[model samples]
Target chain A: MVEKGKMVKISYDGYVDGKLFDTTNEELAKKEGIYNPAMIYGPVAIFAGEGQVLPGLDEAILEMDVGEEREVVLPPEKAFGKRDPSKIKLIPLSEFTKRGIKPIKGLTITIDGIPGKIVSINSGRVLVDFNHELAGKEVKYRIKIEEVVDDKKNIVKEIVKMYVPRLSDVKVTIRNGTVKIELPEFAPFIPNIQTAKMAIANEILKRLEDAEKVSFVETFERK
Target chain B: MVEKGKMVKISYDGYVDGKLFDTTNEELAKKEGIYNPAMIYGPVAIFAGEGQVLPGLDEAILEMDVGEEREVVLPPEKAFGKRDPSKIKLIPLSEFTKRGIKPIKGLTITIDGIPGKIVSINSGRVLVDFNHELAGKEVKYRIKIEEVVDDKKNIVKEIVKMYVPRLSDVKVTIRNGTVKIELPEFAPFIPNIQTAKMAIANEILKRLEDAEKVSFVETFERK
Candidate 1:
């Protein structure tokens, strides 16, 4: 059974049961990468207890057998959680008129250019909600549980590799009283490098159940 | 040679040759949908005489062979037109601050939160230019010419399909004095349906050099 704190690889195709939802394809993701983060292929590692993956998926993994392919139907309650009525709010009509924001269903608008959705309409006030529209939809996931691993070091490496492929040359080293990382000159600036490094170190330490000092150093030559 | 009014299909990957240039992909275009009419993908049909496609791409297509893949670099003048300093104007800072708008560089603030961009900044004035940021940059395009068609009907079909894929069962018919169309009920609301229909009809009439009264009618089950 897939357990918390384990790394698992999966091949999945999601659907609204009869309707095609989405696939783990490179083409669509590649196109999306133009505006968002760069798309990555292959199995994505989901940390079970870390809340790094969807909650429904995290719980469903516990019931999945390794090397077994199964279909899981997750209702809105378990998937994205039930839609919260509180998530929808009504603002003064002036908010729309002042911003010249037109109220249209299914149209994403930014109030003062802040991202939001127009959920409903009233006489003068407009209702806006930030919750994802699919938050209450029943989704069916056909997934193949390819492999699962419990090795802490391997899990850390896989996580790093998946999210930060550009840091391929950064060598991770754990020495007495310290952990040092040597980064290549061409390594791009990762905004949250410290936080990510800390996460990696903490994950490893949590598994090891050991208290030890850790330090990360990046060395780069100016071109 | 690619010319305007000629239908050409090419798989293109756009890259910013310089710092400010960028590319638009199908995902972004599809997400924007018909509300943002400028979004397009695949083989986009353009009237050679009409500036439907980018001027640089229109010219480059003329220099290429069908089924040939080529990299076309468009300088500022040919691509989006050079950025004119005169285009940048200063408005009273009170225009924004009066509405409690915080002016920031790189942040798009609508004078009224309208669809536009922040083009410049000054002490007591704010400048907003409607022109695209990449309007004056050298961009590179990697294009793989897929197909070229000379038939006017096929050209109309391609444009229709590119923008409106839901009308899968619509049959287009041209007769001696008028043009007729049949559509399925599932795809009732076409994006800019009237404009698209008119554009398609015009393209066909112009290409066939036919003198005909054009009209369209849709038959669907009553809901």
Candidate 2:
């Protein structure tokens, strides 16, 4: 068993209403026709007790030891929040007409990047349900704790990779409760590098209890 | 006398058709009834032989020594470039109507950030002169070289100030043909820091020939 702040790897299969929804096992996903070709099949690294998983599942993980297998169930309150009636909106038909789109019942539409389902249309008004599709439902997860990540260098790498994926040539130095990260030359040029750096710093400080300070350095050299 | 790639400070008064258009002297600007409250009237720093001034004025400054006063005349070609007939555009009257603006003769208007003067409106077509106001006109300048900047540290300061104005707490070190600049903590968060860094590096290398390399470092620390 591990405390709340430790990093761990796990393999899990999620189900909604006894129907397979998501799984890290490639063979099981393919057998159930839920296989995603783009997804990498393997144990996933997660920060234990950090709410990286569902609330109920995260709590269950805290009780299980490495190499332990268990099945966890989460209700609507602990999974996706219970569906709310106030989330349904009635939008004018002109909104779709202005965009040269014809709204149909049961169709999914995104406005301003918010996805909503068309539930009904009456008197030039379209009823859209903005609630998540899995809201108000129970979820099940068959989870197995694979390994607990204890390497400081790997911890730093995971934190950096969360912000900047496909990154290579990144240098990390940790000593005496301090972490120093030297990013690749191209990292400084990323459009959202400032935001990424702040987020990485926050996550590292929260997870690494022994780490008192973290410094990110971007050194630019003339070619 | 310094060479072409030197940095220098100069004070100048620009005239067109024997009338003052701009000047670095506050007293002269006020006397001419063209004083701008927002203007900073002082000797301006410029790169010699870099076309920072008019071609005729730049060439004239090259021949004169520091503290030398001289008057230079430039024809339209060397001043703002000869006016081109194709620059006069005939925009439809509906363009102004759509924007809820009235097109009047002798009125200046901006479209897509380009300024133009309305020359005529006839039969639903508005004629605008897109050429520069000083184009096709002779201009003159009374210029005085104030100082030729030779200090490498000051040169770097000038280059950096060009890109990031109102900057403070910036650190600079020059040694063994290498320039190391450590920007203020807030600099890496600026929206255009990447562009500013590139421009500063280019200008530093061009002005400081002895400096073979420039490195910009932005360090972030946890609070």
Candidate 3:
């Protein structure tokens, strides 16, 4: 049985208001007209019973086994939570203009690090709603557990994949409690790659009890 | 003999209007009350006759031999050049305010990628002078050619030093026209280190004809 903090691979399809909103299936996404060319379409590796997914999904995964399929429904509280009236705020229009942004209705903007969508632009104020778009609604997820990640190298790769999506041809080695991750030659050119490297290391060290150290190696080969 | 494009080391003390403005000597810097603890003292490495130094100094160095000492004087034209009246302009005070900067007299700021000093502020306008600080002045330099760098690895190290100042314990290897540079473990954390790595590789390939390729390796080890 899947347990809390267990590394597992899972595929999920999410629906809202009787319509497909998200899915890990490539063909389904294309059929639903929500295909993203850059997204990796496959089972996602995540720690079960962790907050990586919504609380309802996390609780359901703990009772699942490999190859098990279940349909879970989450209410507002178990999902994104009911929308809070206090999350909608009036911001001075100048605040956006000062940052070289034009406050347009329905545009998503980050104000003071909280992401919000502009609901209205009237007079000199912009009404920004900071609540999640899926809040105040029930959601459904058809989730299937693919496998339990037991290999040390695969676990490390999954941790790195969290940061470097679209990453392939990565080499990971484990020996003497030291985990070495060698990225593809183009990894160094990726923006914020340094921050990703540090975060990946932290995750690996925290998740793997035997992982006493983590080393990330980025090599640049001549073109 | 120092020649154009030759990698060489040299030391110099620059004086502007009979006051010490720059020097490679640590003792002199401390004595003149211009010492900076972060500065790297002693001789500096450069390609002889390059535009890295003032025209007068570059021309003087090309005529000198290793261990040779000489004094060179540079008129305004050969130094920072004569200050142009067009370099000074009046800017709207709101320009600074809009960018979250206060127009303070004597503050050095970059406007549109050009470094300039705030000369004065009056009635919603700020006068900024974009000319070099030492423009319109004659300067003198007591210089000595220390050594001509001939070692292949040292040359590569010098090129890396140009980008990673205060860098030490760097490892560089050259074999079969391929140069490998291993930076200190902390290099990946440095801001813009990727840009620096690309620039350093360009310089190495351009300066060293035998260098068919350059590789920069950044290693992150658990603390």
Candidate 4:
């Protein structure tokens, strides 16, 4: 079994009833027609017991061992929990249009993907509620506990995945117990990267005691 | 035994005609009545096998072990190296009087203790060739090796003692192998203190391996 405060990699297919709501499992994405060619299908990494992932999923992982498989059925209260009525808001459609963001009805239509739903299509405005899409809904996640990482460099890399996701390419090096994260070459378009980097460093260092100083390095090759 | 490129703290009393020229040993300073209350008499740190101390003294230390004692007689070349003729230059005596500095003859004369001889003094031009005070002099030093600091923090402290010296009070804190040197208080007349602080850090890190980033913090105590 896994202990509290650890790095874990796992593949999961979360669902509302039999319909797939979210998943990192490749086959599940394909069968449910949620697969995109551009999307990288792989297991998600979580630092167990730190609420890095879903709290319910993190808790379940704590109760399971590595390479073990389990199914957790979470009710609306413990799932995404209750959706606040104040979270729903109606704004002018022109706001999204001006920001070059397209709104689709019944989809998580937010730049931050705050589980916003495009309720109605109006001439100038579209009623959108910013809430957890799975909120107040009974959901289930099929989780498979993967490997636990204890190496400092490996743990830093796992944290980097959360920030960069599909686009970020990073190299991590650990020497003398200090960790350095090298970001891939790119002009600044990513928002809140600094915040994410700090959180990732703090979390990885917390989970892996081997880590000493955490560094984020980026250099322009052409210059 | 002392090795090359390592830091060492030592005690020595230099003698010319049985008179003390310089010393770091406490007893020698007291017996000769050379003990100034303002002077802090302790072991002087030396970076062995380098030019940290006098070339002759450093070379002598390279062959000595901790707690070893030796009476080293340094010739003109090794102690302060040969005095160059070109180093001697003539300047107006007015230059000294204008700056409120008195010009002395025979002994280590003028500011910064540049050795000089009265080769004909003039009101308009005071001729003084600036060479190290001990150059061309046969000096004997009773030297004792106090310690060879291998511990990181102790080694750093030894180096800090080299800069700002007796009156300097510094606090060292190690967090995750990273060093933070809370600088000696007082806004150093200018930013020269930062220059010295950085130089001290660079010198210590070069001599010792355990320290990571060196930070010199100076926060305003009052609004």
Best by lDDT: 3
Q: Estimate each model's TM-score.
A: 0.43, 0.79, 0.70, 0.42
Show the lowest summed lDDT stretch of 10 residues, model 2 chain B: B162-171
Give model 3's TM-score versus the native structure.
0.70
Rank candidates, lDDT, best first.
3, 2, 4, 1
True contacts kept of 3: 0.39
Candidate 1 residue-wise lDDT, B77-127, digit = tens = 988778777656666778778768787776776544433466567776777
Clashing residue pairs found in predicted model 4: B88-B129
lDDT of 4 by residue, A95-191 (tens): 7887677777765566454557788767677887776757788888888976777766666776777666743556777776567566654412255
Query: What is the per-residue lDDT of model 3 for residues A99-158, given as tens digits with 9 covering 90 to 100?
Result: 789988888999787899998988789898999989998998899998888778888888
Error of 4 at A60 (Å): 57
Residue A104, candidate 1: alpha-carbon lDDT: 71
lDDT of 1 at B180: 47
Collision pairs in model 2: none
Model 2: lDDT of residue A90: 92
DockQ of each model vs. true complex? 0.01, 0.33, 0.27, 0.01
Which of candidates 1 and 2 is the stronger one according to TM-score? Answer: 2
Worst 10 residues of 3 chain B by lDDT: B214-223
* DockQ score for candidate 2: 0.33
Candidate 3 residue runs with Cα over 4 Å from true position: A2-7, A16-19, A30-40, A73-138, A147-149, A173-175, A208-210, A219-223, B3-6, B16-20, B30-40, B73-139, B173-176, B208-210, B221-223
Model 3 docking grade: acceptable
